[PDB]
Enzyme design. Sequence first.
Site, PDB file in Angstrom:
ATOM      1  N   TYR A  71      -7.411  -1.133  18.476  1.00  0.00           N
ATOM      2  CA  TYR A  71      -6.146  -1.635  17.965  1.00  0.00           C
ATOM      3  C   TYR A  71      -6.125  -3.155  17.933  1.00  0.00           C
ATOM      4  CZ  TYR A  71      -1.370  -2.085  16.762  1.00  0.00           C
ATOM      5  OH  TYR A  71      -0.262  -2.411  16.034  1.00  0.00           O
ATOM      6  N   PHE A 123       0.890 -13.546 -11.774  1.00  0.00           N
ATOM      7  CA  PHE A 123       0.635 -12.125 -11.663  1.00  0.00           C
ATOM      8  C   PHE A 123       1.911 -11.464 -11.155  1.00  0.00           C
ATOM      9  CE2 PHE A 123      -0.834  -8.266  -9.534  1.00  0.00           C
ATOM     10  CZ  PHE A 123      -1.478  -7.676 -10.598  1.00  0.00           C
ATOM     11  N   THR A 124       2.128 -10.220 -11.581  1.00  0.00           N
ATOM     12  CA  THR A 124       3.400  -9.547 -11.340  1.00  0.00           C
ATOM     13  C   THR A 124       3.808  -9.567  -9.868  1.00  0.00           C
ATOM     14  OG1 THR A 124       2.262  -7.406 -11.231  1.00  0.00           O
ATOM     15  CG2 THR A 124       3.059  -8.124 -13.379  1.00  0.00           C
ATOM     16  N   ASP A 214      -4.636 -18.132  -5.540  1.00  0.00           N
ATOM     17  CA  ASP A 214      -4.746 -16.680  -5.672  1.00  0.00           C
ATOM     18  C   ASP A 214      -6.209 -16.423  -6.003  1.00  0.00           C
ATOM     19  OD1 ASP A 214      -4.932 -14.093  -6.559  1.00  0.00           O
ATOM     20  OD2 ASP A 214      -2.905 -14.084  -7.390  1.00  0.00           O
ATOM     21  N   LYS A 257     -10.801  -6.678  -5.418  1.00  0.00           N
ATOM     22  CA  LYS A 257     -11.413  -7.238  -6.647  1.00  0.00           C
ATOM     23  C   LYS A 257     -12.776  -7.732  -6.254  1.00  0.00           C
ATOM     24  CE  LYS A 257      -6.999  -6.645  -8.200  1.00  0.00           C
ATOM     25  NZ  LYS A 257      -5.972  -7.715  -8.299  1.00  0.00           N
ATOM     26  N   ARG A 381      -0.649  -2.509 -21.594  1.00  0.00           N
ATOM     27  CA  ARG A 381      -0.164  -3.789 -21.099  1.00  0.00           C
ATOM     28  C   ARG A 381       0.624  -4.395 -22.268  1.00  0.00           C
ATOM     29  NH1 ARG A 381       0.085  -4.537 -15.527  1.00  0.00           N
ATOM     30  NH2 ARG A 381      -1.225  -6.372 -15.131  1.00  0.00           N
ATOM     31  N   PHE A 448       6.357   2.521 -16.801  1.00  0.00           N
ATOM     32  CA  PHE A 448       4.964   2.733 -17.170  1.00  0.00           C
ATOM     33  C   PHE A 448       4.316   3.820 -16.321  1.00  0.00           C
ATOM     34  CE2 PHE A 448       4.619  -0.188 -13.637  1.00  0.00           C
ATOM     35  CZ  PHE A 448       3.524   0.296 -12.952  1.00  0.00           C
TER      36      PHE A 448
HETATM   37  C1  LIG Z   1       1.108  -1.006  20.061  1.00  0.00           C
HETATM   38  S1  LIG Z   1       2.678  -0.818  19.219  1.00  0.00           S
HETATM   39  C2  LIG Z   1       2.101  -0.172  17.626  1.00  0.00           C
HETATM   40  C3  LIG Z   1       1.291   1.120  17.768  1.00  0.00           C
HETATM   41  C4  LIG Z   1       2.033   2.211  18.507  1.00  0.00           C
HETATM   42  N1  LIG Z   1       3.028   2.904  17.876  1.00  0.00           N
HETATM   43  C5  LIG Z   1       3.436   2.854  16.590  1.00  0.00           C
HETATM   44  C6  LIG Z   1       4.617   3.660  16.172  1.00  0.00           C
HETATM   45  C7  LIG Z   1       5.199   3.398  14.915  1.00  0.00           C
HETATM   46  C8  LIG Z   1       4.623   2.351  13.996  1.00  0.00           C
HETATM   47  O1  LIG Z   1       3.466   2.886  13.278  1.00  0.00           O
HETATM   48  P1  LIG Z   1       2.237   1.944  12.843  1.00  0.00           P
HETATM   49  O2  LIG Z   1       1.673   1.403  14.144  1.00  0.00           O
HETATM   50  O3  LIG Z   1       2.795   0.866  11.950  1.00  0.00           O
HETATM   51  O4  LIG Z   1       1.325   2.906  12.120  1.00  0.00           O
HETATM   52  C9  LIG Z   1       6.299   4.096  14.554  1.00  0.00           C
HETATM   53  N2  LIG Z   1       6.822   5.030  15.370  1.00  0.00           N
HETATM   54  C10 LIG Z   1       6.279   5.319  16.595  1.00  0.00           C
HETATM   55  C11 LIG Z   1       6.938   6.367  17.420  1.00  0.00           C
HETATM   56  C12 LIG Z   1       5.189   4.635  17.020  1.00  0.00           C
HETATM   57  O5  LIG Z   1       4.697   4.910  18.137  1.00  0.00           O
HETATM   58  C13 LIG Z   1       1.797   2.561  19.790  1.00  0.00           C
HETATM   59  O6  LIG Z   1       0.865   2.051  20.403  1.00  0.00           O
HETATM   60  O7  LIG Z   1       2.522   3.412  20.339  1.00  0.00           O
HETATM   61  C1  LIG Z   2      -4.547  -7.401  -8.457  1.00  0.00           C
HETATM   62  C2  LIG Z   2      -3.932  -8.864  -8.130  1.00  0.00           C
HETATM   63  C3  LIG Z   2      -3.133  -9.221  -7.088  1.00  0.00           C
HETATM   64  C4  LIG Z   2      -2.570  -8.216  -6.047  1.00  0.00           C
HETATM   65  O1  LIG Z   2      -3.560  -7.718  -5.182  1.00  0.00           O
HETATM   66  P1  LIG Z   2      -3.435  -6.276  -4.626  1.00  0.00           P
HETATM   67  O2  LIG Z   2      -4.662  -6.115  -3.738  1.00  0.00           O
HETATM   68  O3  LIG Z   2      -3.459  -5.337  -5.786  1.00  0.00           O
HETATM   69  O4  LIG Z   2      -2.169  -6.112  -3.861  1.00  0.00           O
HETATM   70  C5  LIG Z   2      -2.716 -10.551  -6.940  1.00  0.00           C
HETATM   71  N1  LIG Z   2      -3.154 -11.525  -7.842  1.00  0.00           N
HETATM   72  C6  LIG Z   2      -3.937 -11.175  -8.842  1.00  0.00           C
HETATM   73  C7  LIG Z   2      -4.407 -12.277  -9.822  1.00  0.00           C
HETATM   74  C8  LIG Z   2      -4.347  -9.841  -9.006  1.00  0.00           C
HETATM   75  O5  LIG Z   2      -5.169  -9.458 -10.058  1.00  0.00           O
END
Ligand SMILES: CSCC/C(=[NH+]\C=C1\C(COP(=O)(O)O)=CNC(C)=C1[O-])C(=O)O
Ligand SMILES: *Cc1c(COP(=O)(O)O)cnc(C)c1O
Lengths: 456, 456, 456, 456
Positions: A71, A123-124, A214, A257, A381, A448
């Site tokens: 982690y 870019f969008t 970018d 990319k 596009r 789209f």
């Molecule tokens: C070290 S604190 C982060 C890792 C961790 N938990 C994460 C949780 C998340 C977030 O999910 P994510 O980490 O963004 O995938 C949502 N709900 C619950 C109940 C969790 O336990 C843990 O060690 O317990």
């Molecule tokens: C594709 C793109 C992004 C966004 O990156 P993601 O990894 O798709 O989130 C940003 N800038 C340019 C120029 C891109 O082509």
Amino acid sequence: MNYPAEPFRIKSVETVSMIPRDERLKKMQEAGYNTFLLNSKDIYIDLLTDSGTNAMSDKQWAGMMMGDEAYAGSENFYHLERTVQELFGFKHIVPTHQGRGAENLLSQLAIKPGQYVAGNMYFTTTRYHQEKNGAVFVDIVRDEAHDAGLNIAFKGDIDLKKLQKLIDEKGAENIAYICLAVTVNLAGGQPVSMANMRAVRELTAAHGIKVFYDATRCVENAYFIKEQEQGFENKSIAEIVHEMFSYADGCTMSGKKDCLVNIGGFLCMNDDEMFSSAKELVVVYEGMPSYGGLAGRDMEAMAIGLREAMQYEYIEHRVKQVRYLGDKLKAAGVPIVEPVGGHAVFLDARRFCEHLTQDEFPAQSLAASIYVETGVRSAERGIISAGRNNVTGEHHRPKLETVRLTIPRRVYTYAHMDVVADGIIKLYQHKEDIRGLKFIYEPKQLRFFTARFDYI
Amino acid sequence: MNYPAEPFRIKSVETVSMIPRDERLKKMQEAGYNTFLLNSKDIYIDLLTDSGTNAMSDKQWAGMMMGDEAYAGSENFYHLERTVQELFGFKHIVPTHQGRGAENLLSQLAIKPGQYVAGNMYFTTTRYHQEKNGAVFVDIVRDEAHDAGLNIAFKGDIDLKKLQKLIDEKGAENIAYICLAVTVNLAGGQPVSMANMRAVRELTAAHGIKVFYDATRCVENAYFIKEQEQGFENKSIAEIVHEMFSYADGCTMSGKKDCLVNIGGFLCMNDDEMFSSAKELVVVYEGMPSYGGLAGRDMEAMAIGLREAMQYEYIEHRVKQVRYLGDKLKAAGVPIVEPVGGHAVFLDARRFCEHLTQDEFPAQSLAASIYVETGVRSAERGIISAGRNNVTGEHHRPKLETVRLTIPRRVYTYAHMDVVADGIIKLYQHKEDIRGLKFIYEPKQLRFFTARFDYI
Amino acid sequence: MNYPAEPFRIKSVETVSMIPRDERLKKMQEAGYNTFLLNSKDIYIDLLTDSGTNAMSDKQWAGMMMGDEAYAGSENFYHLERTVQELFGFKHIVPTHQGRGAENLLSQLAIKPGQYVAGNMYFTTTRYHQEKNGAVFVDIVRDEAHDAGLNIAFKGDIDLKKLQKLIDEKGAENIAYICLAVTVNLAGGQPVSMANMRAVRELTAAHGIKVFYDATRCVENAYFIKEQEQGFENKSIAEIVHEMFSYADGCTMSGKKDCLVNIGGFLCMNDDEMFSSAKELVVVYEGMPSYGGLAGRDMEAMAIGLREAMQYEYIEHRVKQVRYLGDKLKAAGVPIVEPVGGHAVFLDARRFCEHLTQDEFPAQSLAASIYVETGVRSAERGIISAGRNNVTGEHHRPKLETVRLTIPRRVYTYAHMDVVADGIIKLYQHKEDIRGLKFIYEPKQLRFFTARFDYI
Amino acid sequence: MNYPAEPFRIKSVETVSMIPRDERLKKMQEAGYNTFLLNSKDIYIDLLTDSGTNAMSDKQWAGMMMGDEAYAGSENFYHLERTVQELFGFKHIVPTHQGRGAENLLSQLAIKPGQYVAGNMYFTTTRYHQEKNGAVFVDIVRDEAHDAGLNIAFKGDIDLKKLQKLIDEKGAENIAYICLAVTVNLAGGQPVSMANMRAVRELTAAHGIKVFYDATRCVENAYFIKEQEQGFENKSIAEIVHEMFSYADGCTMSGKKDCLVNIGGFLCMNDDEMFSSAKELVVVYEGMPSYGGLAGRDMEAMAIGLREAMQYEYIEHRVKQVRYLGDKLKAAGVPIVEPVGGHAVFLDARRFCEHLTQDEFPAQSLAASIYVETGVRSAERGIISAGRNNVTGEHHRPKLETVRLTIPRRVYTYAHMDVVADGIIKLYQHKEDIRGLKFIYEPKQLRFFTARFDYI
Ligand SMILES: CSCC/C(=[NH+]\C=C1\C(COP(=O)(O)O)=CNC(C)=C1[O-])C(=O)O
Ligand SMILES: *Cc1c(COP(=O)(O)O)cnc(C)c1O
Ligand SMILES: CSCC/C(=[NH+]\C=C1\C(COP(=O)(O)O)=CNC(C)=C1[O-])C(=O)O
Ligand SMILES: CSCC/C(=[NH+]\C=C1\C(COP(=O)(O)O)=CNC(C)=C1[O-])C(=O)O
Ligand SMILES: [Cs+]
Ligand SMILES: [Cs+]
Ligand SMILES: [Cs+]
Ligand SMILES: [K+]
Ligand SMILES: [K+]
Ligand SMILES: [K+]
Ligand SMILES: [K+]
């Protein structure tokens, strides 16, 4: 050579079904004539995007077996950090799961409402994150970038006069940063010269203004510098990349990319305080400063892939394979954006189908026709992707009505490019038979992605 | 289409590289002018053999993660058994680590000393195992197979008149079996017709003579039947393969060829007593009847690969890619065996090097010169491979003195074929510079693998 | 510590399952009461053998992605060659697909008909290859190795008086070679001391006799030397291994044991002429001198695994996990071979089934009953494995009539060992119920692999 | 059985190592006494978290080779969608790169600023995203959940009286949603009963209030229901899971916990309009609705892992392995939260360090001391993790001041649990030596991930 052989050989294949035209016709009808709704399993050659669709190497797959999934403090993060520090030269790196995760962080950290962000087109996703945090976007690309048939070098360059003008009218303290993209996607994948990066750095530095790149297609950009910018013909790709980023304060990167991976990105910066602030925010949206929403194995694959991208022969072949497709289309008279960019060919569907009006969605229909005739998926596009104005109720109507042929890295061969070109050219020879499209289902936004059509 | 695009995408890659001519010269001398003694790292495009050099698919690599490594009764064996029974139609299968392991078993089980084994042209390992178990080999291929420039269909067919003569002169009881290979490697990868396989079955059955196929390139053979034999144009590859083996009593298989794997083989048979005896012997040399000297994962990959080989578009492209290379060479005036075979282009070293006699080993020397000038490795298939006559002590003198540009499956592209063709065409312009060779070290059997030479 | 924790953690798993006893009863009968004929899917904990059933590391799996599949000169071969040269010290190496492939080469190269091969206890495949090539096998292990209940150190040592007597009576020139196995499998995995290896080297060298080690469990052997032989307590496992082989002229190796792989082996030798002869023969049965019937990736995995095996904590845990099982069985009064060896616990079926004679195959029946009652597969290592005397046709009658609970490396935990022990202890409580067996199908050699039986 | 054997075998391994205490002391100081800042390579047994640290199966790794990396329409997405629809029963799914990505979407979509979100105890990332979007968090867990030493079943249940009171005082229209977590992480991994889920569904439905589950450890929760809730003894884990989610309007999921993967998550919902809004927002932060910031291979691994998690024997062993550690600690006198939860043992740092006040951060210091003395990494779950009150600026002061020994799934053995227990028992004997800490660097949110401390 005009078109070099692949500087790699095939280690493993992705099998495909090879369904024939009659069956592709049914699939296209079932997808409501929207290529975004086609199933991957029914596509022979998928040119929807060069994002995350790349083929990895044997060395990257070996790295995928060596994920340290801790982690915090994964060894794979330290490999990625060392690699990016060496190759890009930035002091600090924060991993993100892909590019828009880095953009979210940068725009939250570096923008105050009211400020301006000026860039060489947009870019969008990048512009959305700028605007959502209160910036006003200003396009400072040279006027030439907007002329599709203008065959000139380094079309992505910033107009220094536009940048000086913005500074004079709005004031340096009111410019959040300059967003310099390499290459410039919306111009067709057009490169920026080293001279322009250096000049932008000099003008912004004199006013205390930050420049963030970018960097998503920075290696394609470096290839264009080596090939075409006087003085760079014998520099290594790595030497060019390192100098490019020496003119920046940081960058956002989509590893999907030019880092030759299927997922991954990062944010770089030289400033220590911005680094500290970025780490405080990465944990909100992505993950730890040492994983950023990525598995350890993916940090490893991205570190290995960025280094592989520095190989001249790899990037020369990458760009020249795209050029091969564009050259074959141009020689048959098909209108394309010029010059051909690093990652894609763009078809001018407006001129391809002059017998249809833009309100009849020629790009969407041309994309449907391309799939039926060849099994190739391409991206609309044009007016469909531009969306509709929910206030007035009418389309936003884009200047460029295009079909994008976006080439994943190391996936296809010149023979596949021939399949694409031959089908587009055969259609062009009977373009009058391409039928217009009308909506049968249109969502209020992201149309789209799920809109369905029928022929008029 | 003459040259279809690849019916697959690239999933992963491996880099290629070239070393300078002077270094290649030093390496070829260090290898005693035998390309088999060159190191893989020093080769640019490696066409030594199509054996075990194939690119596997994503589905095969998924299977590689599912190895049941049990010493006995692995699920992967049962997958392989079911697949081979379905596709080849033999009652029983015994796995082996590769083809010569199956040949060892067959020759020990089916030959009594003094008996004759008759085949459509010798192969190196096959003939050695026949002779070492006491058989005399008799060539019953049609005379046309030994005429390099004669372009006729199904050059691998057995001459039924030669088979009948052997029966009449020696007696059916003194024929151990008929060895019918598909395709015929050393004739140039030349196919055998379904009509010929049926005729051989009918004639041998009338005398109680067994027929064991060498199935190593049976899918390439099935493609030629579908393409060229009247009445098979609309039959599937799988239907053709199953009918082919319905005319046999069993087979030896090197999976390293048409099963699309890097290791693996098997022995099949319909007779229950022979299966029992084969199992009693497999444990001596290979392993259990349920692993045969293979990891479980490799039985899985071979099961998946054989089924993949049945896809028409895959095998059509495989064969036409080889044909592309031969067509380019022939158009430029380079002499080759015709028609082009399933797995390789065979340069006719006799015509390439008319200034040398066969006793000066022109094919061995040509293979060396190809490497020095191009970095491409190719294989001698002439007097060196033919070996010594086990009675007289003189060289076997095959009419075909050839050099094999052998194409691994799913590894290279047409652009790679262009690089190979261009380099050979250039060597041809100074063919008179190729020097004769003489032995300095000659192994006692299968001498081509490790013999060393010096220039005359 | 008596029972250290695993010096690794789990990277990936394979699910296992128990089936009902009534199903195991039917499966055992369908397998002819031979555990070798059971299917892997029907086994809960598979202790048939430590051969090829090991769990590889992340680093080995990374190597599996780096296979150089070239037919000749693969980089993976050179990695294996360098590793074995460094760690074992032999001049030359010839890869083979597994151990019996190396035994086939050694026995063909080094035995003239009528000569004697002397070894520290027979092994099944080894003895067959010796006898098939015309040798008489002479057991020169110390008498103590044959006594199951004798708990002494270095039970695998050769009795120098037996070797001297063979030299005196038969003449050194009539001894093909000495086979010195480390550890000795069928004595219970019993180690040989460094002092004994030295003494054997001195006596053989004086008479010009060659000594070829069976290196298959040499790392287990080195652990016993480090743990128990005076003067080696502070030497590293690698230092001990290198010294061991300094007393040898070459070795056979099944890499499927201490090299931590699922397939692979090799033959090493110091003599150049024997190396040349071995290379001339490997191409007949296995493959080139630079692949030997293995995929390139497998040579890579074996090179990596042999080095991993040198880690003290790994081999200490390996051996002490086996000891844990044996200690628990002995403490419950179950009769075993002592001391416990490096790779397995050997139940003493002569005592477990005192109500049966050896001619009723008590070890074979005990192995069947263990599977029926517990779902654990184990191997017969007694009269059945010993085979028939090749002069008289009567059974060999080993004093050791045992069932082997053979532990794959890095696969199972102490909790699995508890399951095994608990089940065997429960069966022991009604050992009188184990019925005698008789042959219904007997292969002509290596009969234990596939023989079928019925109850008397 | 209290402690069953692992219902799997080891397929592959990763080495573990320990650096000596003097070096661990230096590393802990360099990490500012925060275990989150230690490097993975410096950890012997890493119990920081069960998030993303799981060992995958062979079947999951096979799926990892079958990634369909298409930007839209990936087969891997459809597999994930089908699996989640089958197993959880929700109408729609949006993938996210991990759990907090789903929390970002839910909180932005379902919260109007000023509204209340009521949950069964806070969680760190969840509460931050609630508050950042303007909600006020209200704890409605039963009071017993805050009583560390009180051993009662289903401690995670919501107190319906607290929910009714919130409705009565604030009004249903001012409650954004109820967040019902299964299990409840910060209460000790404590389960929620089906009866409670049913009662919460009934009361919220009567007032039009939505309920979104946090599904991250829902399979652990289902095991507790099967083991302890009357009426579920003979229901399968899958049947229990499906019923649980029938009482919800959607869920957030971190797949990095009970889906047995290293990366991945998703948001489910039944409401069509919320699904449309979620798809519009996922593009901003994560990616397309068709991949959500994940590689195709990771959607595949998550789909396979969630289905594997439904196997009774797997989840029984998972939970009982944690219980083994907790039972050993409790019997030796070490103070823990009771009963032991599904994923971790929580040490009660209030009782472990009675000489310190909560303002001296006893849990943070105990985690540091555990690492120094044993090489085991554990997580602070007390005042540091609770964060600052976003209204008063004071620390939140949870009754539960704990250190979490968090067990990754399928990674460690009972022998590793014994090592952990022995080291913590030894430290407890000199608990008075643990010194208080003070902040030297405090992030503005989620401060526990990267804060640095010094001893008072
Ligand atoms: C070290 S604190 C982060 C890792 C961790 N938990 C994460 C949780 C998340 C977030 O999910 P994510 O980490 O963004 O995938 C949502 N709900 C619950 C109940 C969790 O336990 C843990 O060690 O317990
Ligand atoms: C594709 C793109 C992004 C966004 O990156 P993601 O990894 O798709 O989130 C940003 N800038 C340019 C120029 C891109 O082509
Ligand atoms: C370099 S010569 C060895 C490799 C090779 N061919 C092998 C064959 C074998 C032996 O099979 P194996 O190699 O033992 O699996 C049997 N029948 C046929 C028809 C073969 O072509 C080749 O390059 O053409
Ligand atoms: C089920 S009997 C076969 C497997 C096996 N042992 C094999 C050995 C071989 C042969 O090696 P290979 O099996 O051909 O690789 C040589 N020397 C020794 C010492 C061996 O133990 C075992 O279970 O103990
Ligand atoms: Cs070309
Ligand atoms: Cs123990
Ligand atoms: Cs236990
Ligand atoms: K992707
Ligand atoms: K992870
Ligand atoms: K195996
Ligand atoms: K190979």
